[PDB]
């Protein structure tokens, strides 16, 4: 560099160091002033990284240097000038760098590799060298650089590359160890498949090099290789098959060792789990995974409570958890998870070979842990365990009463744990049981912790369980919270209030009795905090729509009042428990709520109006902002994003109280329509970040509408731009999951709108979007390894729902622009893949509906013929639906093939009568029932398919043609296959019936209905004329 240039860039450089001023001006002057001066600047920060002997310049330039090339970008650069930064930077590389800075100069050395940059043999020749240096921070950069730009590993030979990780696993310093690892495992994140093969044969030597980091006593560095482990086992699994019991071994000894502290043991844990989330075949077919994982998770869930075995500190503490008992928590995550992807088939067995021996150990913690355990397996497990019920509660309630008061809550928890999992069955089979275990905890000979976690038990019971079966035990129930409801700690009696609350939900109508006694109790709570408050609040609606309106009638004024009081006054956990309350409110007060609206809407506005908060953000700036709970970082196009998660979710939350507002208020909502339509829904849809918001967004619109229709031009408006936004998003949607809700909101658009309601332009512009769509669907069908093991069907279901609509909308018009996806259609319905057999079959017959088609007769009924007579139920049902379609709307014009298949449909028609196939048999029956009508053997199998009871359009054809059969000794057949119909719900038939009837003796008549029970009976009453 020119000498000037130098000490210019030096002084700014070390106006770098320091201050906000001295350190913002020189900011500027860089930003500013230095496409002229970029290579310059590049050179001298190079020079400064690699020569400088002030650390801290060297350091800060380095990191510049980095930052600025890639933003260069360093492809724009002269080939003369990449050379010399290339040299000064590998000079810098191989000369005295302080061990912070050779990592930083080995960053900077990984922004001038790039495929289309020219050749660099000098950085080869010098990683090589480097590598065999008895310099640990030349071996550790070294490798650094190949995990950076992993293909250099494919750049060195073969015979080199595999000795070099082979020495680099084995190497004498932990730090190079772990670099070597990261960058074997990085070769495989970084490469395509068709690459590995080829660092693959190395995963032994890594495995046998692990023992060594427990010989050494270098646990917390084994902790590092684990999650480097962790992470191939994602991308490879299959890798690992036949030294998998090496692994398995390895960890399970690791994970028993239990003075190592926790790191090195929890993510031992991990890696053991998830193989169960990435080859769960592999798992499952070798009885040594099942047996270690469940035996090792028993083991740590005993690790709580240490020194303290009276449990002292924790009877004193509140009902959240001790996050301090990691370990404990970790197992019963990892129980968790591994149960949920192997099944109950698999670990009911090894998991209940030990659960048998814990429960009955004098150590409490293990008779706690088996009860942890179980609670954790039992989701996962359910397929197996729903059936050994009396089995495990003969294991379980026994403790109830343990000696130990963490053992009688792990109890209270497993009751807990099951009555959600194994619902609703164990409500109804097991009340008898379970009630009485529980109610007995609540009384105050037990402790405060055992009876506010059998409270929480009992919501969890009471969730799926039956008014009928609590009916006994309410009062009993009832008194004993109400003790609770007086303890003495906050977190008794919120748990007391929320359990009422949740038996009162349950209890409905049955719970009307308690009424009088608790609601002033609870004004006086209300009157005396926030969660205390608000779990009032919510017991208090809960109740009051488990009585209904009038008996809520009797104190909701009050109610109101308060909750005015609270809502306007000086946690944000009570703003959900007063939002829910309200809305609770206005489900009960039907139309009565109107006069609240003022109230009420507003701060939902507020919320519902969150803007996309997004930050612009870079590299660095990112892992810090991703520290809160409340923001997730994530890249859109290489470039990154700060998105503030927990404000778009509250987005979504108001927005779905917004619309249920609007779905239960009606007409009364309309003064709200226009602002929320276009201030809330409709800009949500461009909420490209978060699809929650978009989907909450296209769930408003046809509600929305519906609400201003029902009170009243505007609507017209609205629904054009409504409807236009959501057809152009069908072109844009990336996630298949939201065009679905589009199309759907779409079709409920349309029928709320009525006729004609949608443009030329629109129908052409849903055409494109229905076809990007399609082919879309087409491309990712087509898809599906040496290395690893509905939301399309649901899709197109819908799609088949919109063209519908659509076609009904324009009356037939449509048809038009459907011709111009016929070839789609065509290939979907000649192709293998029965989804989109099915969905193309579909579409045919919503064709014919609207004799117009003979253009196409001759390709498609070839295809419909097969389909006829496919193992296929869900196939034969729409092939059936098209042939009855054909013979109902275009008759002449297809004559021909529907008398012919007739005998095939006799055929069909006769596994028929199950639940699985009953659907497609009733199309069958009437489509034959269509034939017949449209042009005697055959009508005679046609009445051996009544009664006609799952598919409703079928139904509502086959009791219209019974009707004509006769207007125009089966008798109680007759009788019976009507009775049927309307007592399964599925469709003046009744008419005809009665004149029939009139044509028999009065006792003949009677005897028909002889066989019925009285429910039917006195249905069959209200029935007849």
């Known amino acids: 560099l020119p000498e000037e240039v130098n000490r210019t860039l030096l002084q700014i450089v070390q106006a770098f160091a320091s201050d906000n001023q001295i350190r913002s001006v020189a900011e500027k002057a860089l930003s500013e002033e230095w496409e002229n001066n970029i290579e310059y600047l590049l050179t001298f920060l190079a020079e400064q990284a690699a020569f400088s002997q002030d650390t801290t310049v060297a350091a800060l330039s380095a990191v510049l240097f980095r930052k600025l090339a890639l933003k260069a970008p360093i492809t724009h650069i002269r080939k003369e000038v990449l050379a010399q930064i290339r040299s000064s930077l590998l000079k810098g590389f191989l000369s005295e760098r302080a061990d912070s800075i050779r990592h930083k100069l080995s960053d900077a050395i990984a922004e001038c590799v790039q495929d289309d940059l020219p050749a660099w043999p000098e950085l080869l020749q010098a990683l090589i060298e480097s590598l065999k240096s008895?310099?640990?921070?030349?071996?550790?950069?070294?490798?650094?650089?190949?995990?950076?730009?992993?293909?250099?590993?494919?750049?060195?030979?073969?015979?080199?590359?595999?000795?070099?990780?082979?020495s680099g696993f084995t190497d004498a310093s932990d730090n190079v160890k772990i670099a070597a690892v990261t960058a074997f495992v990085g070769y495989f994140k970084q490469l395509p498949k068709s690459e590995w093969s080829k660092l693959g044969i190395l995963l032994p030597s890594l495995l046998n090099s692990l023992p060594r980091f427990l010989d050494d006593g270098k646990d917390d560095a084994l902790a590092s290789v684990f999650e480097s482990l962790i992470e191939l086992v994602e991308l490879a699994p299959k890798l690992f098959k036949?030294?998998?019991?090496?692994?398995?071994?390895?960890?399970?000894?690791?994970?028993?060792?239990?003075?190592?502290?926790?790191?090195?043991?929890?993510?031992?844990?991990?890696?053991?789990?998830?193989?169960?989330?990435?080859?769960?075949?592999?798992?499952?077919?070798?009885?040594?995974?099942?047996?270690?994982?469940?035996?090792?998770?028993?083991?740590?869930?005993?690790?709580?409570?240490?020194?303290?075995?009276?449990?002292?500190?924790?009877?004193?503490?509140?009902?959240?958890?001790?996050?301090?008992?990691?370990?404990?928590?970790?197992?019963?995550?990892?129980?968790?998870?591994?149960?949920?992807?192997?099944g109950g088939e698999y670990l009911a067995a090894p998991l209940f070979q030990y659960l048998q021996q814990m429960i009955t150990s004098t150590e409490w913690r293990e008779r706690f842990?088996?009860?942890?355990?179980?609670?954790?397996?039992?989701?996962?497990?359910?397929?197996?365990?729903?059936?050994?019920?009396?089995?495990?509660?003969?294991?379980?309630?026994?403790?109830?009463?343990?000696?130990?008061?963490?053992?009688?809550?792990?109890?209270?928890?497993?009751?807990?744990?099951?009555?959600?999992?194994?619902?609703?069955?164990?409500?109804?089979?097991?009340?008898?049981?379970?009630?009485?275990?529980?109610?007995?905890?609540?009384?105050?000979?037990?402790?405060?912790?055992?009876?506010?976690?059998?409270?929480?038990?009992?919501?969890?019971?009471?969730?799926?369980?039956?008014?009928?079966?609590?009916?006994?035990?309410?009062?009993?129930?009832?008194?004993?919270?109400?003790?609770?409801?007086?303890?003495?700690?906050?977190?008794?009696?919120?748990?007391?209030?929320?359990?009422?609350?949740?038996?009162?939900?349950?209890?409905?109508?049955?719970?009307?009795?308690?009424?009088?006694?608790?609601?002033?109790?609870?004004?006086?709570?209300?009157?005396?905090?926030?969660?205390?408050?608000?779990?009032?609040?919510?017991?208090?609606?809960?109740?009051?729509?488990?009585?209904?309106?009038?008996?809520?009638?009797?104190?909701?004024?009050?109610?109101?009042?308060?909750?005015?009081?609270?809502?306007?006054?000086?946690?944000?956990?009570?703003?959900?428990?007063?939002?829910?309350?309200?809305?609770?409110?206005?489900?009960?007060?039907?139309?009565?709520?109107?006069?609240?609206?003022?109230?009420?809407?507003?701060?939902?506005?507020?919320?519902?109006?969150?803007?996309?908060?997004?930050?612009?953000?870079?590299?660095?700036?990112?892992?810090?902002?991703?520290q809160y709970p409340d923001w997730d970082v994530v890249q859109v196009q290489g470039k990154h994003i700060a998105i503030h998660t927990s404000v778009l979710d509250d987005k979504v939350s108001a927005m779905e109280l917004l619309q249920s507002y609007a779905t239960l208020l009606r007409g009364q909502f309309a003064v709200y329509v226009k602002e929320v339509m276009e201030e809330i829904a409709l800009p949500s849809l461009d909420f490209y970040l978060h699809d929650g918001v978009r989907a909450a967004g296209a769930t408003l619109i046809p509600i929305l509408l519906s609400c201003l229709l029902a009170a009243t031009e505007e609507l017209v408006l609205l629904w054009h731009k409504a409807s236009s936004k959501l057809i152009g998003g069908l072109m844009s949607e990336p996630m298949p999951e939201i065009t679905?809700?589009?199309?759907?909101?779409?079709?409920?658009?349309?029928?709320?709108?009525?006729?004609?309601?949608?443009?030329?332009?629109?129908?052409?512009?849903?055409?494109?979007?229905?076809?990007?769509?399609?082919?879309?669907?087409?491309?990712?069908?087509?898809?599906?390894?040496?290395?690893?093991?509905?939301?399309?069907?649901?899709?197109?279901?819908?799609?088949?729902?919109s063209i519908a609509a659509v076609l009904k909308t324009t009356n037939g018009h449509y048809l038009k622009n459907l011709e111009n996806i016929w070839p789609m259609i065509n290939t979907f319905l000649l192709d293998n893949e029965?989804?989109?057999?099915?969905?193309?079959?579909?579409?045919?017959?919503?064709?014919?509906?609207?004799?117009?088609?003979?253009?196409?007769?001759?390709?498609?009924?070839?295809?419909?013929?097969?389909?006829?007579?496919?193992?296929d139920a869900r196939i034969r049902q729409?092939?059936?639906?098209?042939?009855?379609?054909?013979?109902?709307?275009?008759?002449?014009?297809?004559?021909?093939?529907?008398?012919?298949?007739?005998?095939?449909?006799?055929?069909?028609?006769?596994?028929?009568?199950?639940?699985?196939?009953?659907?497609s048999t009733e199309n069958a029956s009437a489509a034959i029932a269509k034939i017949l009508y449209a042009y005697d053997t055959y009508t005679a199998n046609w009445f051996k398919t009544l009664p006609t009871i799952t598919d409703k359009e079928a139904a509502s054809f086959n009791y219209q043609f019974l009707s004509q059969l006769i207007e125009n000794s089966n008798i109680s057949a007759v009788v019976d296959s009507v009775i049927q119909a309307l007592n399964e719900r599925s469709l003046t038939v009744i008419s005809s019936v009665k004149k029939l009837l009139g044509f028999l003796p009065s006792s003949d008549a009677m005897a028909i209905f002889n066989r019925y029970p009285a429910d039917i009976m006195e249905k069959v009453h209200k029935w007849f004329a």
């Open 369 to 626: 842990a088996a009860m942890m355990a179980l609670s954790s397996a039992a989701e996962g497990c359910a397929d197996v365990l729903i059936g050994e019920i009396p089995k495990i509660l003969d294991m379980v309630i026994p403790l109830i009463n343990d000696p130990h008061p963490r053992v009688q809550y792990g109890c209270c928890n497993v009751l807990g744990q099951i009555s959600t999992d194994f619902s609703p069955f164990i409500q109804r089979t097991a009340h008898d049981r379970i009630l009485p275990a529980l109610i007995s905890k609540l009384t105050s000979e037990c402790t405060s912790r055992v009876q506010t976690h059998a409270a929480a038990a009992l919501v969890n019971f009471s969730e799926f369980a039956s008014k009928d079966i609590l009916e006994p035990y309410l009062d009993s129930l009832l008194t004993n919270l109400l003790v609770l409801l007086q303890s003495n700690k906050l977190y008794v009696q919120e748990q007391a209030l929320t359990t009422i609350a949740f038996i009162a939900e349950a209890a409905k109508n049955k719970f009307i009795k308690y009424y009088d006694t608790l609601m002033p109790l609870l004004l006086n709570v209300l009157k005396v905090n926030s969660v205390l408050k608000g779990k009032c609040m919510e017991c208090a609606t809960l109740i009051g729509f488990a009585v209904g309106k009038e008996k809520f009638h009797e104190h909701s004024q009050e109610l109101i009042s308060i909750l005015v009081a609270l809502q306007n006054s000086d946690d944000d956990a009570l703003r959900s428990y007063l939002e829910q309350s309200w809305s609770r409110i206005c489900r009960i007060l039907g139309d009565d709520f109107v006069p609240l609206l003022p109230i009420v809407i507003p701060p939902l506005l507020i919320t519902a109006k969150a803007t996309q908060d997004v930050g612009l953000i870079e590299e660095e700036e990112a892992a810090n902002f991703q």
């Open 242 to 342: 036949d030294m998998f019991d090496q692994i398995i071994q390895f960890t399970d000894m690791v994970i028993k060792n239990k003075d190592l502290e926790p790191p090195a043991r929890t993510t031992a844990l991990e890696l053991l789990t998830v193989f169960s989330e990435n080859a769960p075949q592999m798992c499952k077919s070798n009885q040594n995974y099942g047996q270690t994982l469940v035996m090792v998770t028993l083991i740590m869930m005993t690790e709580v409570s240490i020194d303290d075995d009276d449990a002292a500190e924790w009877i004193e503490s509140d009902d959240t958890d001790d996050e301090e008992e990691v370990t404990y928590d970790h197992a019963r995550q990892a129980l968790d998870r591994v149960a949920l992807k192997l």
């Open 878 to 919: 729409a092939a059936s639906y098209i042939i009855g379609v054909c013979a109902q709307y275009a008759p002449s014009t297809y004559a021909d093939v529907c008398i012919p298949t007739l005998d095939t449909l006799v055929q069909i028609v006769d596994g028929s009568k199950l639940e699985e196939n009953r659907s």
């Open 740 to 801: 679905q809700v589009y199309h759907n909101s779409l079709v409920n658009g349309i029928k709320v709108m009525g006729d004609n309601c949608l443009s030329e332009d629109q129908l052409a512009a849903f055409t494109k979007g229905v076809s990007a769509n399609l082919t879309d669907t087409y491309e990712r069908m087509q898809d599906r390894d040496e290395y690893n093991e509905f939301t399309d069907e649901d899709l197109l279901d819908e799609i088949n729902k």
């Open 134 to 166: 008895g310099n640990p921070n030349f071996r550790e950069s070294s490798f650094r650089i190949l995990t950076t730009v992993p293909y250099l590993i494919t750049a060195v030979d073969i015979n080199s590359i595999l000795p070099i990780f082979q």
């Open 834 to 871: 029965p989804i989109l057999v099915i969905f193309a079959l579909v579409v045919i017959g919503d064709l014919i509906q609207y004799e117009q088609t003979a253009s196409m007769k001759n390709a498609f009924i070839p295809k419909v013929t097969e389909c006829l007579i496919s193992p």
